[PDB]
Coordinates of C-alpha atoms in Angstrom, one line a residue:
Chain A
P1 CA 75.0 -118.8 13.0
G2 CA 76.8 -119.9 9.8
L3 CA 75.1 -123.2 9.5
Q4 CA 73.6 -122.0 6.2
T5 CA 77.1 -121.6 4.9
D6 CA 78.1 -125.2 5.5
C7 CA 74.8 -126.5 4.2
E8 CA 75.2 -124.6 1.0
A9 CA 78.8 -125.8 0.8
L10 CA 77.6 -129.4 1.0
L11 CA 74.9 -128.8 -1.6
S12 CA 77.4 -127.2 -3.9
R13 CA 80.0 -129.9 -3.5
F14 CA 77.3 -132.5 -4.3
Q15 CA 75.8 -130.7 -7.3
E16 CA 79.2 -130.2 -8.7
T17 CA 79.8 -134.0 -8.9
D18 CA 76.4 -134.2 -10.8
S19 CA 75.6 -137.3 -8.8
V20 CA 72.4 -138.9 -7.5
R21 CA 74.3 -141.6 -5.8
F22 CA 73.9 -141.4 -2.0
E23 CA 77.4 -142.9 -1.9
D24 CA 78.9 -139.7 -3.1
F25 CA 76.8 -137.9 -0.4
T26 CA 78.1 -140.3 2.2
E27 CA 81.7 -139.6 1.2
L28 CA 81.0 -135.8 1.2
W29 CA 79.5 -136.3 4.7
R30 CA 82.6 -138.2 6.0
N31 CA 85.0 -135.7 4.4
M32 CA 83.2 -132.5 5.7
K33 CA 82.7 -134.5 8.9
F34 CA 79.1 -133.5 9.5
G35 CA 79.1 -136.2 12.2
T36 CA 80.3 -133.2 14.3
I37 CA 78.0 -130.5 13.1
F38 CA 75.7 -131.2 16.1
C39 CA 78.5 -132.4 18.3
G40 CA 79.5 -129.9 21.0
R41 CA 78.5 -128.8 24.4
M42 CA 74.8 -127.7 24.3
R43 CA 72.5 -128.4 27.2
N44 CA 69.2 -129.1 25.5
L45 CA 67.6 -125.9 24.3
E46 CA 70.2 -124.5 22.0
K47 CA 70.5 -128.1 20.7
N48 CA 67.0 -128.7 19.6
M49 CA 66.6 -125.1 18.5
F50 CA 69.6 -125.4 16.2
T51 CA 68.3 -128.8 15.0
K52 CA 64.9 -127.2 14.2
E53 CA 66.6 -124.4 12.3
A54 CA 68.9 -126.8 10.3
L55 CA 66.0 -129.1 9.3
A56 CA 64.0 -126.1 8.2
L57 CA 67.0 -124.9 6.2
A58 CA 67.5 -128.2 4.5
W59 CA 63.8 -128.4 3.7
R60 CA 63.5 -124.9 2.2
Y61 CA 66.5 -125.9 0.1
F62 CA 64.7 -129.0 -1.0
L63 CA 61.8 -127.1 -2.6
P64 CA 61.6 -125.5 -6.0
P65 CA 62.8 -123.5 -7.9
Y66 CA 66.1 -125.1 -6.8
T67 CA 67.8 -127.5 -9.3
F68 CA 67.1 -131.2 -9.4
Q69 CA 70.6 -131.9 -8.3
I70 CA 70.3 -129.4 -5.5
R71 CA 66.9 -130.8 -4.6
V72 CA 68.2 -134.4 -4.3
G73 CA 71.2 -133.0 -2.4
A74 CA 68.9 -131.3 0.1
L75 CA 66.9 -134.4 0.4
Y76 CA 70.0 -136.4 1.3
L77 CA 70.9 -133.6 3.7
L78 CA 67.5 -133.8 5.4
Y79 CA 68.1 -137.5 5.7
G80 CA 71.5 -137.2 7.2
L81 CA 70.6 -134.4 9.6
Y82 CA 67.3 -136.0 11.0
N83 CA 69.1 -139.3 11.3
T84 CA 71.9 -137.6 13.2
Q85 CA 70.7 -135.8 16.3
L86 CA 71.4 -135.9 20.0
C87 CA 68.0 -134.8 21.4
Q88 CA 65.9 -137.9 22.4
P89 CA 62.7 -136.5 20.6
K90 CA 64.2 -136.5 17.0
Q91 CA 62.9 -133.1 15.8
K92 CA 60.6 -133.6 12.8
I93 CA 60.6 -131.9 9.5
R94 CA 58.0 -129.2 9.0
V95 CA 56.1 -130.0 5.9
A96 CA 53.4 -127.8 4.5
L97 CA 50.2 -128.7 2.6
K98 CA 51.1 -126.7 -0.5
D99 CA 54.7 -128.2 -0.7
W100 CA 53.5 -131.7 -0.1
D101 CA 51.4 -131.7 -3.3
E102 CA 54.6 -131.1 -5.3
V103 CA 56.9 -133.3 -3.2
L104 CA 54.4 -136.0 -4.2
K105 CA 55.0 -135.7 -7.9
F106 CA 58.7 -135.1 -7.2
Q107 CA 58.9 -138.5 -5.5
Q108 CA 56.9 -140.0 -8.3
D109 CA 59.4 -138.6 -10.9
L110 CA 62.3 -139.9 -8.8
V111 CA 60.8 -143.3 -9.0
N112 CA 60.2 -142.8 -12.7
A113 CA 63.6 -141.3 -13.5
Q114 CA 65.3 -144.5 -12.1
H115 CA 66.7 -142.4 -9.2
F116 CA 66.0 -145.1 -6.7
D117 CA 68.6 -143.9 -4.2
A118 CA 66.7 -140.6 -3.5
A119 CA 63.4 -142.4 -3.9
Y120 CA 64.3 -144.9 -1.2
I121 CA 65.7 -142.1 1.0
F122 CA 62.3 -140.3 0.8
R123 CA 60.4 -143.5 1.4
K124 CA 62.5 -144.1 4.5
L125 CA 62.1 -140.6 5.8
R126 CA 58.3 -141.1 5.5
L127 CA 58.5 -144.6 7.1
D128 CA 60.3 -143.4 10.2
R129 CA 57.7 -140.6 10.4
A130 CA 60.0 -137.6 10.4
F131 CA 57.3 -135.2 9.2
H132 CA 55.2 -132.8 11.1
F133 CA 52.5 -132.0 8.6
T134 CA 51.7 -128.3 9.4
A135 CA 49.3 -125.9 7.8
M136 CA 51.4 -122.8 7.2
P137 CA 55.2 -123.4 7.0
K138 CA 57.3 -123.3 10.2
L139 CA 55.1 -121.1 12.4
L140 CA 53.0 -118.0 12.4
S141 CA 52.5 -114.9 14.7
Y142 CA 52.1 -111.0 14.5
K143 CA 69.8 -119.1 -5.0
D144 CA 70.1 -121.5 -7.9
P145 CA 67.3 -120.2 -10.3
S146 CA 65.1 -122.1 -12.7
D147 CA 65.2 -120.0 -16.0
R148 CA 61.8 -119.6 -17.7
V149 CA 63.7 -119.0 -21.0
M150 CA 64.8 -122.7 -21.2
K151 CA 61.2 -123.7 -20.3
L152 CA 60.2 -121.6 -23.3
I153 CA 63.0 -122.4 -25.7
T154 CA 64.7 -125.8 -25.5
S155 CA 67.0 -127.6 -27.8
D156 CA 64.0 -129.9 -28.6
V157 CA 61.9 -126.8 -29.2
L158 CA 64.3 -125.2 -31.7
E159 CA 64.9 -128.6 -33.2
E160 CA 61.1 -129.2 -33.8
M161 CA 60.9 -125.6 -35.2
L162 CA 63.7 -126.2 -37.7
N163 CA 62.2 -129.6 -38.7
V164 CA 58.8 -128.1 -39.5
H165 CA 60.5 -125.1 -41.2
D166 CA 62.5 -127.2 -43.6
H167 CA 59.4 -129.4 -44.1
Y168 CA 57.3 -126.3 -45.0
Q169 CA 60.1 -125.1 -47.3
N170 CA 60.2 -128.4 -49.2
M171 CA 56.4 -128.5 -49.2
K172 CA 55.8 -125.0 -50.6
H173 CA 58.4 -126.0 -53.2
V174 CA 56.1 -128.8 -54.4
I175 CA 52.5 -127.6 -53.8
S176 CA 52.7 -124.8 -56.4
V177 CA 52.8 -125.5 -60.1
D178 CA 56.6 -125.1 -60.2
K179 CA 59.6 -125.1 -57.8
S180 CA 61.3 -121.8 -58.6
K181 CA 58.6 -119.1 -58.6
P182 CA 57.2 -118.3 -55.1
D183 CA 54.3 -115.8 -55.3
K184 CA 55.0 -112.4 -53.7
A185 CA 52.2 -113.1 -51.3
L186 CA 53.7 -116.5 -50.5
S187 CA 57.3 -115.5 -49.4
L188 CA 56.6 -113.7 -46.2
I189 CA 57.8 -116.5 -43.8
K190 CA 61.2 -115.8 -42.2
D191 CA 63.8 -118.4 -42.9
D192 CA 66.0 -116.8 -40.1
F193 CA 63.2 -116.8 -37.4
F194 CA 65.0 -119.9 -35.9
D195 CA 68.2 -117.9 -36.1
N196 CA 66.5 -114.9 -34.5
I197 CA 65.4 -117.0 -31.5
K198 CA 68.9 -118.4 -31.2
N199 CA 70.3 -114.9 -31.2
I200 CA 67.8 -113.8 -28.5
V201 CA 68.5 -116.7 -26.2
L202 CA 72.3 -116.4 -26.7
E203 CA 72.3 -112.7 -26.0
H204 CA 70.2 -113.3 -22.9
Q205 CA 72.7 -116.0 -21.8
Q206 CA 75.7 -113.7 -22.4
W207 CA 74.0 -110.9 -20.5
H208 CA 73.7 -113.3 -17.6
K209 CA 77.3 -114.3 -18.1
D210 CA 78.6 -110.7 -17.9
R211 CA 76.2 -110.3 -15.0
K212 CA 78.1 -113.0 -13.1
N213 CA 81.4 -111.8 -14.7
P214 CA 82.9 -109.1 -12.6
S215 CA 84.9 -106.1 -13.8
Chain B
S1 CA 34.8 -85.2 -29.1
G2 CA 32.7 -87.4 -26.8
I3 CA 33.5 -86.2 -23.3
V4 CA 31.2 -83.6 -21.7
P5 CA 32.6 -81.6 -18.8
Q6 CA 30.9 -82.0 -15.4
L7 CA 30.4 -78.6 -13.7
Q8 CA 31.8 -78.5 -10.2
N9 CA 31.3 -74.9 -8.8
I10 CA 29.5 -71.8 -9.8
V11 CA 30.1 -68.4 -8.3
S12 CA 27.2 -66.0 -9.0
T13 CA 26.3 -62.7 -7.4
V14 CA 23.1 -60.8 -6.6
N15 CA 22.2 -57.3 -5.3
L16 CA 19.8 -57.1 -2.4
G17 CA 19.5 -53.3 -2.8
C18 CA 19.6 -52.5 0.9
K19 CA 22.4 -52.0 3.4
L20 CA 22.6 -54.6 6.2
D21 CA 24.1 -55.0 9.7
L22 CA 26.3 -58.1 9.8
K23 CA 26.0 -58.3 13.5
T24 CA 22.2 -58.6 13.3
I25 CA 22.2 -61.2 10.5
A26 CA 25.0 -63.2 12.1
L27 CA 23.3 -63.4 15.5
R28 CA 19.9 -64.1 14.0
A29 CA 20.7 -66.4 11.1
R30 CA 20.8 -70.2 11.4
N31 CA 24.0 -71.3 9.7
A32 CA 25.8 -67.9 9.6
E33 CA 29.4 -67.2 10.5
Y34 CA 30.9 -63.8 10.9
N35 CA 34.4 -63.0 12.2
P36 CA 35.1 -59.4 11.0
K37 CA 38.7 -59.6 12.4
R38 CA 39.4 -62.0 9.6
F39 CA 36.9 -61.2 6.9
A40 CA 34.2 -58.5 6.6
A41 CA 31.3 -60.7 5.5
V42 CA 28.7 -63.2 6.7
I43 CA 29.2 -66.8 5.5
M44 CA 25.8 -68.6 5.4
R45 CA 25.8 -72.2 4.2
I46 CA 22.7 -74.2 3.2
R47 CA 22.5 -78.0 2.6
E48 CA 20.0 -78.7 -0.1
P49 CA 21.6 -76.7 -2.9
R50 CA 24.7 -77.2 -0.8
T51 CA 25.9 -73.7 -1.2
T52 CA 27.9 -71.0 0.5
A53 CA 26.7 -67.4 0.4
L54 CA 28.8 -64.5 1.4
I55 CA 26.7 -61.5 2.3
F56 CA 28.2 -58.0 2.5
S57 CA 27.2 -54.9 4.4
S58 CA 26.6 -53.1 1.0
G59 CA 23.8 -55.5 0.1
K60 CA 25.7 -57.6 -2.4
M61 CA 25.7 -61.3 -2.0
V62 CA 27.8 -64.0 -3.8
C63 CA 26.5 -67.6 -3.9
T64 CA 29.2 -70.2 -4.5
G65 CA 29.3 -74.0 -4.5
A66 CA 26.1 -74.7 -6.5
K67 CA 26.6 -77.0 -9.5
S68 CA 24.0 -75.6 -11.8
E69 CA 22.9 -72.2 -13.1
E70 CA 19.3 -72.8 -12.0
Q71 CA 20.5 -74.4 -8.7
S72 CA 22.6 -71.3 -8.1
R73 CA 19.7 -69.0 -8.7
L74 CA 17.5 -71.0 -6.3
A75 CA 20.2 -70.9 -3.6
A76 CA 20.5 -67.2 -4.1
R77 CA 16.7 -66.8 -3.8
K78 CA 16.8 -68.9 -0.6
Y79 CA 19.4 -66.6 0.9
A80 CA 17.4 -63.6 -0.2
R81 CA 14.3 -64.9 1.5
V82 CA 16.4 -65.6 4.6
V83 CA 17.7 -62.1 4.8
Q84 CA 14.2 -60.7 4.1
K85 CA 12.9 -62.7 7.0
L86 CA 15.5 -61.3 9.4
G87 CA 13.8 -57.8 9.0
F88 CA 15.4 -56.2 6.0
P89 CA 14.0 -55.0 2.6
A90 CA 15.8 -57.7 0.5
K91 CA 15.4 -57.4 -3.3
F92 CA 16.6 -59.5 -6.2
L93 CA 18.7 -57.3 -8.5
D94 CA 21.0 -58.3 -11.4
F95 CA 21.6 -61.9 -10.4
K96 CA 24.6 -62.5 -12.5
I97 CA 27.0 -65.5 -12.9
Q98 CA 30.6 -64.6 -12.4
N99 CA 32.4 -68.0 -12.7
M100 CA 31.8 -71.6 -13.6
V101 CA 34.4 -74.3 -12.9
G102 CA 34.1 -77.4 -15.0
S103 CA 36.1 -80.6 -14.7
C104 CA 36.4 -83.7 -16.9
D105 CA 38.8 -86.5 -17.6
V106 CA 40.1 -87.6 -21.0
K107 CA 41.2 -91.1 -19.8
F108 CA 44.8 -91.1 -20.9
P109 CA 48.0 -89.8 -19.4
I110 CA 49.4 -86.8 -21.3
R111 CA 53.0 -85.7 -21.9
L112 CA 53.2 -82.1 -20.7
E113 CA 56.7 -81.2 -22.0
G114 CA 55.4 -81.8 -25.6
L115 CA 52.4 -79.6 -25.0
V116 CA 54.4 -76.7 -23.3
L117 CA 56.9 -76.8 -26.2
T118 CA 54.1 -76.8 -28.7
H119 CA 52.2 -73.9 -27.2
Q120 CA 54.8 -72.0 -25.3
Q121 CA 52.8 -68.8 -26.0
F122 CA 49.9 -70.2 -23.9
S123 CA 50.9 -72.8 -21.4
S124 CA 52.6 -71.9 -18.2
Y125 CA 53.9 -75.2 -16.9
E126 CA 56.2 -75.1 -13.8
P127 CA 56.2 -78.4 -11.9
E128 CA 57.9 -76.8 -8.8
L129 CA 55.0 -74.4 -8.3
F130 CA 51.9 -76.3 -9.4
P131 CA 52.2 -79.8 -10.9
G132 CA 49.7 -79.1 -13.7
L133 CA 50.0 -77.2 -16.9
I134 CA 48.0 -74.0 -17.3
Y135 CA 46.7 -73.4 -20.8
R136 CA 45.1 -70.0 -21.1
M137 CA 42.7 -70.3 -24.0
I138 CA 42.2 -67.1 -25.8
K139 CA 39.2 -67.4 -28.2
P140 CA 37.0 -68.2 -25.1
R141 CA 38.8 -66.7 -22.1
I142 CA 39.0 -69.9 -20.1
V143 CA 42.0 -71.2 -18.1
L144 CA 42.5 -75.0 -18.3
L145 CA 44.5 -76.9 -15.7
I146 CA 45.8 -80.1 -17.4
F147 CA 47.4 -82.8 -15.4
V148 CA 49.5 -85.9 -16.2
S149 CA 46.6 -88.1 -15.3
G150 CA 44.4 -86.5 -17.9
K151 CA 42.2 -84.5 -15.6
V152 CA 41.3 -81.2 -17.2
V153 CA 39.9 -78.5 -14.9
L154 CA 38.4 -75.6 -16.9
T155 CA 37.7 -72.4 -15.1
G156 CA 36.9 -68.7 -15.5
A157 CA 33.9 -69.2 -17.6
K158 CA 30.7 -67.1 -17.7
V159 CA 28.3 -69.6 -19.3
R160 CA 28.2 -73.4 -19.8
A161 CA 28.5 -73.0 -23.6
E162 CA 31.9 -71.4 -23.0
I163 CA 33.2 -74.4 -21.1
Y164 CA 31.9 -76.7 -23.8
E165 CA 33.5 -74.7 -26.6
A166 CA 36.7 -74.5 -24.7
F167 CA 37.0 -78.2 -24.0
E168 CA 36.1 -79.1 -27.5
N169 CA 38.8 -76.8 -28.7
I170 CA 41.3 -78.3 -26.3
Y171 CA 40.4 -81.9 -26.9
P172 CA 42.4 -82.7 -30.1
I173 CA 45.4 -80.8 -28.9
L174 CA 45.5 -83.2 -25.9
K175 CA 44.7 -86.2 -28.1
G176 CA 47.9 -85.3 -29.9
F177 CA 50.0 -85.8 -26.7
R178 CA 48.6 -89.0 -25.3
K179 CA 51.5 -90.7 -23.5
Chain C
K1 CA 66.4 -92.6 -18.5
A2 CA 63.7 -92.6 -15.8
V3 CA 62.0 -89.6 -17.3
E4 CA 62.2 -91.1 -20.8
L5 CA 60.8 -94.4 -19.4
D6 CA 58.0 -92.3 -17.7
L7 CA 58.6 -94.0 -14.4
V8 CA 58.1 -90.7 -12.6
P9 CA 55.1 -89.0 -14.3
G10 CA 54.2 -85.6 -12.9
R11 CA 57.1 -85.6 -10.5
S12 CA 59.1 -82.4 -10.1
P13 CA 62.4 -82.6 -12.0
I14 CA 64.2 -81.7 -8.8
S15 CA 62.5 -84.5 -6.9
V16 CA 63.5 -86.9 -9.7
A17 CA 67.1 -85.7 -9.7
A18 CA 67.4 -86.0 -5.9
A19 CA 66.1 -89.6 -6.1
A20 CA 68.5 -90.4 -8.9
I21 CA 71.4 -88.9 -7.0
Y22 CA 70.4 -91.0 -4.0
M23 CA 70.2 -94.1 -6.2
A24 CA 73.5 -93.4 -7.8
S25 CA 75.0 -92.5 -4.4
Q26 CA 73.9 -95.7 -2.8
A27 CA 75.3 -97.7 -5.6
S28 CA 78.8 -96.3 -5.2
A29 CA 81.4 -96.0 -2.4
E30 CA 80.3 -92.4 -1.6
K31 CA 76.9 -92.9 0.0
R32 CA 74.7 -90.0 1.0
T33 CA 71.6 -90.1 3.1
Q34 CA 68.2 -88.8 2.0
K35 CA 68.6 -85.9 4.5
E36 CA 71.9 -85.0 3.0
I37 CA 70.6 -85.0 -0.6
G38 CA 67.4 -83.2 0.4
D39 CA 69.3 -80.4 2.1
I40 CA 71.4 -79.6 -1.0
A41 CA 68.5 -80.4 -3.4
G42 CA 65.9 -78.5 -1.3
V43 CA 63.6 -81.6 -1.3
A44 CA 62.1 -83.2 1.7
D45 CA 63.4 -86.7 2.4
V46 CA 59.8 -88.0 2.1
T47 CA 59.7 -86.7 -1.5
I48 CA 63.0 -88.3 -2.3
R49 CA 61.7 -91.5 -0.8
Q50 CA 58.6 -91.4 -3.0
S51 CA 60.4 -90.6 -6.2
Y52 CA 63.1 -93.2 -5.4
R53 CA 60.5 -95.9 -4.7
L54 CA 59.1 -95.3 -8.2
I55 CA 62.4 -95.8 -10.0
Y56 CA 63.8 -98.5 -7.6
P57 CA 62.0 -101.4 -9.4
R58 CA 63.8 -100.7 -12.7
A59 CA 67.1 -99.8 -11.1
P60 CA 69.3 -102.1 -13.3
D61 CA 67.8 -100.6 -16.5
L62 CA 68.4 -97.0 -15.4
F63 CA 72.0 -97.4 -14.4
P64 CA 74.7 -96.9 -17.1
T65 CA 76.0 -100.1 -18.6
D66 CA 79.7 -99.3 -17.7
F67 CA 79.0 -98.5 -14.0
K68 CA 81.1 -100.2 -11.3
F69 CA 78.7 -101.1 -8.5
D70 CA 80.3 -100.9 -5.1
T71 CA 76.9 -102.1 -3.8
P72 CA 75.2 -104.5 -6.2
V73 CA 72.0 -103.2 -7.8
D74 CA 70.2 -106.1 -6.2
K75 CA 71.2 -105.0 -2.7
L76 CA 70.2 -101.4 -3.2
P77 CA 68.8 -99.9 0.0
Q78 CA 65.3 -101.0 1.1
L79 CA 62.6 -98.2 1.1
Chain D
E1 CA 47.2 -132.2 -55.1
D2 CA 44.4 -130.3 -53.3
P3 CA 44.4 -127.5 -50.7
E4 CA 42.3 -129.7 -48.4
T5 CA 45.5 -131.2 -47.1
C6 CA 46.7 -127.6 -46.6
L7 CA 43.6 -126.9 -44.7
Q8 CA 44.0 -129.8 -42.3
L9 CA 47.7 -129.3 -41.8
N10 CA 47.2 -125.7 -41.0
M11 CA 44.4 -126.6 -38.6
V12 CA 46.8 -129.0 -36.7
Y13 CA 49.6 -126.4 -36.8
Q14 CA 47.2 -123.8 -35.3
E15 CA 46.1 -126.3 -32.7
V16 CA 49.6 -127.0 -31.5
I17 CA 50.7 -123.3 -31.6
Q18 CA 47.5 -122.4 -29.7
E19 CA 48.3 -125.0 -27.0
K20 CA 51.7 -123.3 -26.8
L21 CA 49.9 -120.0 -26.2
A22 CA 47.7 -121.7 -23.6
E23 CA 50.7 -122.8 -21.6
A24 CA 52.5 -119.5 -22.1
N25 CA 49.5 -117.4 -21.1
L26 CA 49.1 -119.6 -18.0
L27 CA 52.7 -118.8 -17.2
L28 CA 52.0 -115.1 -17.8
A29 CA 49.0 -115.3 -15.4
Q30 CA 51.1 -117.0 -12.8
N31 CA 53.8 -114.4 -13.1
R32 CA 51.4 -111.5 -12.9
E33 CA 49.8 -113.2 -9.8
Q34 CA 53.3 -113.3 -8.3
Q35 CA 53.8 -109.6 -9.1
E36 CA 50.4 -108.8 -7.5
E37 CA 51.4 -110.8 -4.4
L38 CA 54.7 -108.9 -4.2
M39 CA 52.9 -105.5 -4.6
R40 CA 50.5 -106.4 -1.8
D41 CA 53.5 -107.4 0.3
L42 CA 54.8 -103.9 -0.3
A43 CA 51.3 -102.6 0.8
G44 CA 51.0 -105.1 3.7
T45 CA 48.7 -103.9 12.2
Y46 CA 51.3 -104.7 14.9
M47 CA 49.6 -106.7 17.7
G48 CA 49.9 -103.4 19.6
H49 CA 46.7 -102.2 17.9
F50 CA 45.0 -105.2 19.6
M51 CA 45.7 -104.5 23.3
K52 CA 43.1 -103.9 26.0
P53 CA 40.8 -101.8 23.8
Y54 CA 40.8 -104.6 21.2
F55 CA 37.9 -102.9 19.4
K56 CA 39.2 -99.4 18.6
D57 CA 37.2 -97.1 16.3
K58 CA 38.3 -95.7 13.0
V59 CA 36.7 -92.2 13.4
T60 CA 38.1 -92.0 16.9
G61 CA 40.6 -93.9 19.0
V62 CA 38.4 -94.9 21.9
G63 CA 37.2 -98.5 22.3
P64 CA 33.8 -99.9 23.1
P65 CA 31.8 -98.8 26.1
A66 CA 32.3 -100.6 29.4
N67 CA 30.6 -104.0 29.9
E68 CA 27.9 -104.7 32.4
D69 CA 30.2 -107.5 33.7
Chain E
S1 CA 66.8 -110.2 -7.0
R2 CA 63.8 -112.5 -7.4
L3 CA 61.8 -109.5 -8.5
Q4 CA 64.2 -108.8 -11.3
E5 CA 64.4 -112.4 -12.3
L6 CA 60.6 -112.6 -12.5
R7 CA 60.3 -109.4 -14.4
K8 CA 62.9 -110.4 -17.0
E9 CA 61.1 -113.7 -17.4
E10 CA 57.9 -111.7 -17.8
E11 CA 59.5 -109.7 -20.6
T12 CA 60.9 -112.8 -22.2
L13 CA 57.5 -114.5 -22.3
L14 CA 55.8 -111.2 -23.5
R15 CA 58.3 -111.1 -26.5
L16 CA 57.6 -114.8 -27.2
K17 CA 53.9 -114.1 -27.1
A18 CA 54.2 -111.1 -29.4
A19 CA 56.2 -113.1 -32.0
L20 CA 53.8 -116.0 -31.8
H21 CA 50.8 -113.7 -32.0
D22 CA 52.2 -112.2 -35.2
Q23 CA 52.6 -115.8 -36.3
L24 CA 48.9 -116.6 -35.6
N25 CA 47.7 -113.4 -37.3
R26 CA 49.7 -114.2 -40.5
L27 CA 48.5 -117.8 -40.2
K28 CA 44.9 -116.8 -40.1
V29 CA 45.5 -114.5 -43.1
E30 CA 46.8 -117.5 -44.9
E31 CA 43.8 -119.5 -43.8
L32 CA 41.4 -116.9 -45.2
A33 CA 43.4 -116.9 -48.4
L34 CA 43.1 -120.7 -48.5
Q35 CA 39.3 -120.5 -48.0
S36 CA 39.0 -118.0 -50.8
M37 CA 41.2 -120.0 -53.2
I38 CA 39.4 -123.3 -52.5
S39 CA 36.0 -121.6 -53.0
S40 CA 37.2 -120.3 -56.4
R41 CA 38.8 -123.6 -57.4
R42 CA 35.8 -125.7 -56.4
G43 CA 33.6 -123.3 -58.3
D44 CA 35.3 -124.5 -61.5
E45 CA 33.8 -128.0 -61.4
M46 CA 30.2 -127.0 -60.4
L47 CA 29.6 -125.9 -64.0

């Protein structure tokens, strides 16, 4: 009933600061006053139902393809929520088998990437046993995207391309008898291929821009 | 070419040379049907050649549904012996084929509009009547139903060689319009 | 564009047009139901549904570039 | 000095670019698997079809015969 | 929305694969040229 809105608002406010410091999250929590998000007259059933839903929401936010900043924000969100309930049986987080296999290497990277704040948050959430390890997610009866383009073309990718291109240029300058006569059958390589890839990626990005740009 | 058309249906006729009662045949034949209020003939189906014979009071029979010239003749002879057994002087006169439907697939979707614009004098393609193009070949008089999936249904023939000739003629013309 | 892209092969041109009108109608303020478009087009709403379902996947490509979407192409009606 | 260096350098370049295709084709296979999953979602019983006659026929609508129990 | 994002990524990676496959085809043409030239050159000292 609108909880998704405030959760997304907190996630956005956190990813805008571009922080992994749980102190910024604590300040955003104190400002948005999430200490009240559960507070209110509920008997027991609406209470734990809404808590279940909020935890499931924060978890599904935690998963890919959401951004690393968004993922760490959702992790801090899960931490705050689960650690802030009113029901005596602190509802657990529903964790799948498929998603656990990736949360493993995500925690490993967090340790590796010197993000010890989120790493300690996750180790704590495991230590207090906040996880119900289910088979299929939630139950069973009856977005901030991750662009593949940047996975294909990076600044490092284009940089390596241009390095090897200039290397091949300087090398085909030398390997022949002279430096000024390239054979007709030895001039086919495009020197603008790098430029063509830049053009493709920039036209895609400006397409996305005018997609978000209204008119 | 490379694709041979598979026959699917063969309408042949035969003359028994003796008038019949349809009531008698219908009441005394195994798999006969006869409702004169809807059609004046006896519809006798048999399983092994899997054929449907229409038998008429005049003594003329038409065997449809067999997928071979020999098979059609054999089904006709079966129905002839059947009528002979029911107490009539059946005979076997001018057994003559009258149609052979063939069907084949060329394995590529075709652009119809190109074809109808190319052979407007032949093709009659109206997708709000029948979603296939109808190419009326002239050298052999065979009507070819051509569809967007590549299925070609040749019909109107009088011998297998005619379907083969017609399909070989029509093959490159379709090859030219592979979508 | 749908015919050129061959997204509706073998479909009757009236069925394609009715589906296109439904797609364009649903993407603008003036929204018409399948029954409304079928009555004028003479096409059963089932036929409009089938033709529309074939061109729905590539909806953004078919629409004109300078089209003001009252309803975003992403939120086009489920069918 | 000798094309042999050209041979080995082109071998290593082909190796790296082929590894790039390996990764890219795995991505393509994953994307096509996702597309197939979405199509089957479009092509995906109601728990009403599993009431008292839980074993309904496909050529008919009647269930199994009554049980000796 | 996810469908269109996935399909555009699919087209992106198809175009990248097409370009790189042209690259490999021309690279293998160069490789065959190298093989022929090295055979011819090494044939000059076997005399």
